[PDB]
Structure 1
Amino acid sequence: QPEPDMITIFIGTWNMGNAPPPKKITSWFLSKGQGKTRDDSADYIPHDIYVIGTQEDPLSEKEWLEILKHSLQEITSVTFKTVAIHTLWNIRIVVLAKPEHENRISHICTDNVKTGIANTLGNKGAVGVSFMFNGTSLGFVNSHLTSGSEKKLRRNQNYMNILRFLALGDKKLSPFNITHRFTHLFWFGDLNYRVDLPTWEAETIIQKIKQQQYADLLSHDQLLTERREQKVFLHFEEEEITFAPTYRFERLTRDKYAYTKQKATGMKYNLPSWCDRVLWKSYPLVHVVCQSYGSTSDIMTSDHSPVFATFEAGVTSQFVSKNGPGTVDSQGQIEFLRCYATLKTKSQTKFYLEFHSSCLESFVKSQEGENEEGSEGELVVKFGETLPKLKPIISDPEYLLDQHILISIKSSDSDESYGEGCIALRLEATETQLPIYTPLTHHGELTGHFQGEIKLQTSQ
């Protein structure tokens, strides 16, 4: 049986509004309803991995797992295996996989982050799961961020606390947060960003939704505008939204949005909004294609509608040569030429690099770079041709061209990372000097850039 080079992944997010689900929720897993929906001809074809995020989930883990497994069994006639389940308060993530994948999946991690302090600590935060699927690392985050139209900045803060403190993936990747630890990272949930239009315009917004005219609403969606201004989710993707706002509905129908202020809402308006979202970030030049992104129309127990997204995701096999794992393949090398980092920092420490990659036996520390002043104020750290030649464990080009090098630029004084980025080895040529580039981030914010040339030697 050949190892796959592509899998499909289902992502669901549903704020259940503290209510039990209805008896049938199959439309969710079938990507049926509004938006970018899945073809009927695919209904019986199981996805490889199903990742279900709930918020305001009133069920026990056992109760929800029985519902999910029953649902998938009905659709696919396959009995899925539980990879992981993790709950923080009423925020939950379940990962299910086809049984043929059970011995492809390893290094399963779970974690949670509680957001806020005192007043604001006790119900918002995130849960996450990571694992390896053969040679590919996969990470999944379900977050329930702060509510309320006038709290976008708090949501942005919640995002940065989650990506800083969620401890998933390979702990040896110490300089890297979750936004660099995975080949594919999916981040979804009740992100709680709202359509920022005046309260007076509620009925106008409703009219627009009934006409399926979302353009003038999406131009005011706080998540799209904050992302465009680089305030949140830097270097993440989201499919175009083509489904109606998923919040706030009257329960037991989808005919009415319940937007007016009530004691139950703390006297806050809930104008129709796209609270419920799926975003992703994959390493450069890895295959990832969104094949559905929408909301169900027939699941009406909550004041939110479920959201689905599905993806094709490239995966690689667990490579064994005669040499690596457990020795180098002298036929292989990575040379970083004429490299320099441009940093936004005002500090004047010396810097060194660390190169991390599962194609290396362990991470590689460079010598300190040479600091110069950029013409527009910046720090430029030059490494010249001084950088250590990296010796991958396997030289086979079918393996090496699919790998990535994580780079951290660290202060000599403090050993703290000032910036993190990633370089693909999916080059246009081997044994050839080629330009490379990554932005550098720290705590998910832009801190600089790294650029130069690479020369990759494989066994071919």
Structure 2
Amino acid sequence: EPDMISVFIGTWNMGSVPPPKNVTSWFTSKGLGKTLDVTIPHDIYVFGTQENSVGDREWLDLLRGGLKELTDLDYRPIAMQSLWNIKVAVLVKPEHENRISHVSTSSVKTGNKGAVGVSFMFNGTSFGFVNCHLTSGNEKTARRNQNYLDILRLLSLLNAFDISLRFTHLFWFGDLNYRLDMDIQEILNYISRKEFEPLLRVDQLNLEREKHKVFLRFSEEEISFPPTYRYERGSRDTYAWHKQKPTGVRTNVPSWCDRILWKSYPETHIICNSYGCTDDIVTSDHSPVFGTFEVGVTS
């Protein structure tokens, strides 16, 4: 009977290391951006991650018990898919168990990079969740754009007919790994002034969307939080933008690598309540990103 449902899409690049004891902020959209700083539990939790070194059943344990400590409800996993260290998981309120149908998972390798995806039906309405890791490196904007198109065609979630038209609501999140077309100096000035707008005019992802090359007719909430990459581990005061190392020196300008985009159909409405990132979770050089939405469901 529920006309509306709240969905949580969380994306985090764990950075080849396990998570910490506490990850409440992430779950509850606490931190910076369009944030939620009662704590009422979401109808569905959907977790995407990119360099998650925790085992697949181990990892899903943490999610289940992290939600139990928070909500006091046994969220039950509907589906889960892994592709090396790229992993996604879809959990749901016990009561909503017998509304999920036609659940499907799939993966696509574009080494080590690609997409992991789940789709399913909630009553009448259909959903799609793609989680991905794309080609890294400031100048590799063409290869990412390829990655998208390959994931858009090759992902198996009516399948041998269309692509990003299959689902009522398609969310697409993860480490899209798109950078800023700017020199470190300005980037850092604009970050210290908390003036992200001039940097977003120049963000690669936005530039390719604006050139109608990738993510056609996709929507994204307006970013008002600092670039999620690349931090120094152990705090969030310091971008790790030019460390020297025996494995080479790497010149990474801070970027909004981590993103949540969606595409719905008309007359089927969906508002976005939260879209931000943490500031307390400091085990990875990425900061985890969250996004919460209210979504229309029918019989």
The interval holding the TM-score normalised by the smaller chain is over 0.9
Is 1:146–1:154's contact at 8 Å kept on the other side of the alignment?
yes
Mapped partners of 2:196, 2:139: distance in 1: 21
Work out which of the residue numbers 97, 100, 121 in structure 2 matches 1:132.
Answer: 121
- In the alignment, the residues of structure 2 paired with residue 38 and residue 79 of structure 1 have an alpha-carbon distance, to the nearest angstrom, of 23
The normalised TM-score by structure 2 is 0.97
More moved, 212-221 vs 241-250: 212-221
SS at match of 1:286: coil
**Contact 1:140–1:187 under 8 Å retained in 2:** yes
In structure 2, the partner of 1:296 is 278
CA distance in 1, matches of 2:146, 2:65: 38
1:390-429 paired onto structure 2 within 5 Å: none
Once the two structures are superposed, residues 356-414 of structure 1 have per-residue CA deviations (whole angstroms, 9 ceiling, x without a partner) of xxxxxxxxxxxxxxxxxxxxxxxxxxxxxxxxxxxxxxxxxxxxxxxxxxxxxxxxxxx
Query: Which residue identity is paired with 1:218?
Result: L
Partner of 1:190: 175
**Can you list the C-alpha shifts for 1:204-240, whole angstroms capped at 9, x where unaligned?**
3223212211011111100011100111101110100
Secondary structure at the residue paired with 1:280? strand
User: Is contact 1:113–1:126 with CA below 8 Å preserved after alignment?
Assistant: yes
Aligned counterparts of 1:80 and 1:266: Cα–Cα separation in 2: 44
Q: Please give the alpha-carbon distance, in whole angstroms, between the structure 2 residues aligned to 1:265 and 1:152.
A: 23
Q: For 2:136, give the aligned amino acid.
A: S
Using the TM superposition, give the Cα deviation of residue 73 of structure 1 relative to its aligned residue in structure 2, in angstroms. 1.1
The answer on whether the counterparts of 1:145 and 1:158 sit within 8 Å (CA) in structure 2 is yes
Q: TM-score, normalising length from structure 1?
A: 0.64
1:70 counterpart residue number: 65
Give deviations 1:68-119, integer Å, cap 9, x for gaps.
112111221111000011100000000000010110001110000000xxxx
- State whether structure 2 residue 209 is matched by structure 1 residue 211: no
Q: Tell me whether 1:262 sits opposite 2:253 in the alignment.
A: no
Of 120, 129, 150, which aligns to 1:161?
150
Instruction: Report the CA distance between 1:124 and its aligned residue.
Output: 0.3
If each structure's strand is expressed as a fraction of its own residues, which one has the higher value? 1
- What's the secondary structure of 2:179's corresponding residue? coil
Map of 2:161 onto structure 1? 175
Please name the residue that 2:16 is paired with.
Answer: 18
* AA matched with 2:33: G
d(CA) in 2 for partners of 1:180 and 1:63?
34
Measured at CA, do residues 258 and 265 of structure 1 come closer, stay the same or move farther in structure 2, by a change above 3 Å?
farther
Aligned counterparts of 1:257 and 1:296: Cα–Cα separation in 2: 15
Q: Which residue of 2 aligns with 1:396?
A: none
For 1:240, what is the secondary structure of its paired residue?
A: coil
**In structure 2, how many angstroms separate the alpha carbons of the residues matched to 1:223 and 1:159?**
12
Q: Given the superposition, is the C-alpha separation of residues 134 and 262 from structure 1 closer, same or farther in structure 2, using an over 3 Å criterion?
A: same
C-alpha deviation, 1:268, in angstroms = 3.3
Alignment of 1:282-293 (within 5 A): 282-293=264-275
Name the aligned partner's letter for residue 230 of structure 1.
H
TM-superposed CA distance for 1:137, in Å, is 0.5
Cα distance in structure 2, aligned partners of 1:146 and 1:229: 20
Partner Cα distance (1:25, 1:294) in 2 = 14
Instruction: Read off the aligned partner of 1:163 and give its amino acid letter.
Output: L
The amino acid that maps onto 2:112 is N
Distance 1:243 1:236, change over 3 A: same
Of residues 4, 7, 29 in structure 2, which corresponds to 1:6? 4
Q: Corresponding residue for 1:458?
A: none
Greater radius of gyration (CA) = 1
2:30 partner SS:
coil
Q: Indicate which of 308, 332, 338 corresponds to 2:290.
A: 308
Residue number in structure 2 paired with 1:32: 30
**1:80 counterpart residue number:** 75
Letter in 2 for 1:192: N
Is residue 91–residue 127 contact of structure 1 (8 Å, CA) maintained in 2? yes
Runs of 4+ aligned residues of structure 1 deviating over 3 Å after TM superposition are 261-268
Q: Secondary structure at the match of 1:175?
A: coil
Amino acid corresponding to residue 247 of structure 1 in structure 2? Y
Q: Which structure is richer in relative contact order (CA contacts within 8 A, separation 6 or more)?
A: 2
Alignment of 1:356-367 (within 5 A): none
Give, in whole Å, the separation in 1 of the partners of 2:97 and 2:247: 44
The aligned counterpart of 1:89 is: 84
Aligned pairs for 1:28-67 within 5 A: 28-39=26-37, 41=38, 43=39, 45-67=40-62
- 1:17 is matched by which residue type in structure 2? G
Per-residue deviation at 1:203? 3.6
**Number of the residue aligned with 2:229:** 247
Report the equivalent of 1:383.
Answer: none
Instruction: Give the aligned CA root-mean-square deviation in angstroms.
Output: 1.2
Aligned to 1:148: 137
CA contact (8 A) 1:148 1:268 kept: no
Q: What is aligned with 1:416?
A: none
Give ranges in structure 1 of 5+ residues lacking alignment: 116-121, 318-460
Q: Alpha-carbon deviations, 1:307-338, whole Å to 9, x = none?
A: 00000111101xxxxxxxxxxxxxxxxxxxxx
Distance 2:68 2:15 in 1: 25
Q: CA separation in 2, counterparts of 1:297 and 1:5?
A: 34
Q: Deviations for 1:234-268, whole angstroms, at most 9, x for unmatched residues?
A: 11101000000000000010010000153477533
